[PDB]
Design a protein around this ligand. Structure first.
Ligand SMILES: O=C1CC[C@@H](c2cccs2)N1Nc1ncnc2[nH]cc(I)c12
Length: 167
């Protein structure tokens, strides 16, 4: 039993909810919140901009030190950093950004990072300003993640379409 509330169960291990991931993280304080990161960990907009804002820019400060030491992530890759006031840990995962021409096949590799964590609160990777089809992203998530994932979908209209169209 865990503290997530109000989720629709899609499969044995995948759950979904219309919610703001920032507000969901602040309420649940999960072990892992997933960020929709880019390879430079520049958290300017979308989910990343919102999560970083909620940490009062501490996420960005930590991230800049990480990049200075380690260099950029790979598309499809991830790193574990602090969750600050939102979670114990933040798993920064880089899905392909279609608006940059990145290969959508890398979306499966991105979701594979979730399997290193027993339970996660997460957005749909590569959705929103990353330009991929959120219905497809949900399909890849369900077919790739085997650990327990709680998906937060900010847009109510999108959430209803994802549920209604889910096979
Ligand atoms: O609703 C969706 C569907 C795809 C995804 C993205 C689209 C472009 C970049 S990410 N998204 N965003 C969010 N999901 C949950 N909480 C959130 N808080 C702030 C935001 I913005 C946000």
């Amino acid at each position: 039993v865990n503290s997530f509330s109000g989720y629709l169960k899609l499969t044995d291990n995948v759950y979904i909810k219309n919610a703001d991931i920032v507000e969901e993280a602040k309420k649940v304080k999960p072990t892992v919140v997933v960020n929709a990161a880019n390879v430079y960990l520049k958290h300017g907009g979308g989910v990343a901009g919102a999560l970083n804002k909620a940490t009062n820019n501490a996420m960005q400060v930590e991230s800049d030190d990480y990049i200075a030491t380690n260099g950029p992530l790979k598309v499809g890759g991830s790193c574990v950093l602090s969750g600050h006031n939102l979670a114990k840990h933040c798993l920064h995962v880089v899905g392909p950004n279609v608006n940059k021409g990145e290969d959508i096949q890398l979306l499966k590799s991105a979701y594979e990072n979730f399997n290193q964590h027993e339970v996660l609160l997460a957005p749909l990777l590569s959705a929103g300003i990353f330009g991929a089809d959120p219905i497809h992203s949900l399909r890849v998530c369900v077919d790739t993640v085997r650990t327990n994932v709680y998906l937060a979908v900010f847009d109510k209209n999108l959430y209803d379409k994802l549920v209604s169209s889910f096979l």
